[PDB]
């Protein structure tokens, strides 16, 4: 609240300093921001405690940055950490005390939890509460009455208005409890699903699963893990532990196929007990319990086929012990979020690897599913070797004179097609691909503009893939990339970042970017995180190049796009010039070729 002569806020008169400040490695700002030291001997204990009570926002190598909020404190209480149980240790760890503001915030957030519980039974959602005064003073506004369908006091609530009531309670200061007591539940018989000994659970996966199952009752929340970290394995383990009917929701055909494959591989459950509620192919969804389907199908708004209508009615009628949702970052979308209310589930677990978006709808996930239970430390995984170390780099390509002339001259938005296609970046990508091809490194080129992708691919006679590409040709190209030594590069379009199971690649070049999309950036980066059989963290075997054009909007987009990666800790090294480019022969070495490319770009319209 107090501002120094500079931008930073003043806290000299706010909180004191502990005498043993050197011993205490923890800081506590009044706003809730906490700065932990990664060099302290008690760093591991401090990391565990701060991860338990707060969500990371920036975890560089030296000083980690966390911030705590109501959702994080509710998650702490869910895993069973009381207000004293957290605040006493926070004061002990803190080297400068705990401000009264944070003290009162923690007290209020902890006490305002568990008073209101939401439990669904016999397809009816009852808002139970041991304390009656909570309901007595919660029925002040008329929205609750119009919502409600027309000790331990409970009342039934309308299915459709659950989301509205929950978001209302979040700001009403009475969060709802979504804990599932699968251990004590006789209404829905347990499913015959077990985890085979073959599956191996990594320490971070076990920690995330523990945070989810803080107690005997499963907690509904979101667990963010890298795509290569085995989030599918974590979800399968969660379903197996729940031992009740599980509905997994993918985002595409590839996602549902991969989910079924993961289920069969890691769970002893028989093949016949798993169904694919997919329009392309179905396996009698009503027949078995464990189901894998898609947001599009479940939330489909237009006319429903007869068989799909029967399946949807069966799904609505039945109650699901677990609702797994992969790629939760798309949930807050209208149709996708409608699925949450369409289907009934005790706990809706969420898994993803890039929980970031521009529109401020990510905060809605906290109530749509639950608080962010776990968020894996990418740097720690890199050190442990679970994830391949990546030498993140941004190659700056000077824009050609003429191309810059038209780009600046035109105030329209042909620049997206223009700066994405310039001779300098073309030569840079050609030289980089040549260098990695002679180094036997697998290349996955990326480009949002299909026009630019096709031009580059024809000029380099490479197998570009894109949306309306035939499925058979797509599979053939992927198989050739994985097996045929003569080919070691594939030019994938935006379809690549959506969902796929691609072979591990040693390099990932990105000539063009869709925009300031942290989601796309992280999604494409996750492709090369696949750990090799015997690599090492310090070898930096994996490389990521994000080619950008100097003095163009692409620079702003790249800077706005690398925010999530830098927050994780990756250091994007800038490369102004590439050694050997002048000696190496590359296309567009004369003014004329650039001229024809510019003419084609202009005629593109």
């Amino acid at each position: 609240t107090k501002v120094d002569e500079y931008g930073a806020k003043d806290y000299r008169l706010q909180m004191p300093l502990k005498d043993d400040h050197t011993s205490r490695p923890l800081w506590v700002a009044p706003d809730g921001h906490i700065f932990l030291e990664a060099f302290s001997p008690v760093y591991k204990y401090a990391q565990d405690f701060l991860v338990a009570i707060a969500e990371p926002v920036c975890r560089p190598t030296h000083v980690h940055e966390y911030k705590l909020t109501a959702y994080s404190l509710y998650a702490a209480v869910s895993v069973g950490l009381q207000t004293s149980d957290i605040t006493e240790y926070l004061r002990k760890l803190s080297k400068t005390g705990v401000p009264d503001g944070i003290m009162q915030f923690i007290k209020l957030c902890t006490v305002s939890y568990g008073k209101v519980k939401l439990v669904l039974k016999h397809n009816r959602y009852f808002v139970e509460s041991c304390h009656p005064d909570v309901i007595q003073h919660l029925l002040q506004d008329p929205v609750i009455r119009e919502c409600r369908l027309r000790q331990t006091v409970s009342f039934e609530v309308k299915q459709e208005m659950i989301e509205e009531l929950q978001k209302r309670c979040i700001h009403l200061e009475y969060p709802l409890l979504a804990e599932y007591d699968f251990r004590n539940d006789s209404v829905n018989p347990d499913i015959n699903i077990d985890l085979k000994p073959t599956a191996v659970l990594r320490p971070y996966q076990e920690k995330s699963l523990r945070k989810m199952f803080g107690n005997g009752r499963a907690r509904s929340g979101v667990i963010v893990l890298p795509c290569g970290a085995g989030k599918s394995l974590v979800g399968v383990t969660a379903a197996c532990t729940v031992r009740k009917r599980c509905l997994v929701l993918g985002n595409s055909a590839v996602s549902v196929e991969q989910w079924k494959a993961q289920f069969k591989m890691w769970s002893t459950i028989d093949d016949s007990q798993i169904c694919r509620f997919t329009s392309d192919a179905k396996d009698k969804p009503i027949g078995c319990s464990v189901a894998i389907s898609t947001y599009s199908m479940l939330g489909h708004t237009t006319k429903r086929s007869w068989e799909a209508e029967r399946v949807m009615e069966w799904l609505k009628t039945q109650e699901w012990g677990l609702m797994i949702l992969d790629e939760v970052h798309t949930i807050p979308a209208k149709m996708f979020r409608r699925v949450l209310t369409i289907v009934q589930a005790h706990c809706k677990l969420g898994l993803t690897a890039t929980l970031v978006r521009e529109d401020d709808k990510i905060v809605d996930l906290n109530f749509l599913i639950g608080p962010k239970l776990y968020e894996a430390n990418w740097m720690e995984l890199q050190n442990n070797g679970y994830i391949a170390k990546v030498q993140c780099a941004e190659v700056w390509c000077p824009m050609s004179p003429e191309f810059y002339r038209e780009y600046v001259a035109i105030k329209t938005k042909k620049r997206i097609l223009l700066y994405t296609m310039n001779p300098n970046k073309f030569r840079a990508c050609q030289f980089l691909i040549k260098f990695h091809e002679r180094r036997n490194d697998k290349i996955i080129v990326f480009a949002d503009n299909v026009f630019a992708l096709k031009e580059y691919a024809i000029r380099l006679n490479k197998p570009y893939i894109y949306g309306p590409t035939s499925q058979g040709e797509r599979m053939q190209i992927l198989q050739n990339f994985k097996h045929n030594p003569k080919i070691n590069t594939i030019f994938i379009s935006k379809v690549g970042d959506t969902s796929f199971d691609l072979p591990e690649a040693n390099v990932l070049i990105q000539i063009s970017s869709h925009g300031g999309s942290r989601r796309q950036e992280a999604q494409r980066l996750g492709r090369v995180l696949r750990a090799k059989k015997g690599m090492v963290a310090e070898e930096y075997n994996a490389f990521f190049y994000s080619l950008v054009s100097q003095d163009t909007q692409e620079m702003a987009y790249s800077t706005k796009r690398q925010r999530f990666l830098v927050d994780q800790g990756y250091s994007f090294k800038v490369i102004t010039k590439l050694a050997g480019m002048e000696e190496e022969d590359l296309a567009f070495s004369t003014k004329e070729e650039q001229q024809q490319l510019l003419q084609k770009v202009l005629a593109a319209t």
């Binding site: 251990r183 699963l209 523990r210």
Partner: peptide
Amino acid sequence: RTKRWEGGYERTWEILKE
């Protein structure tokens, strides 16, 4: 037959005392 996760949170910091 329950799993280790159902037991409870590890509470890794509880070991340290001052």
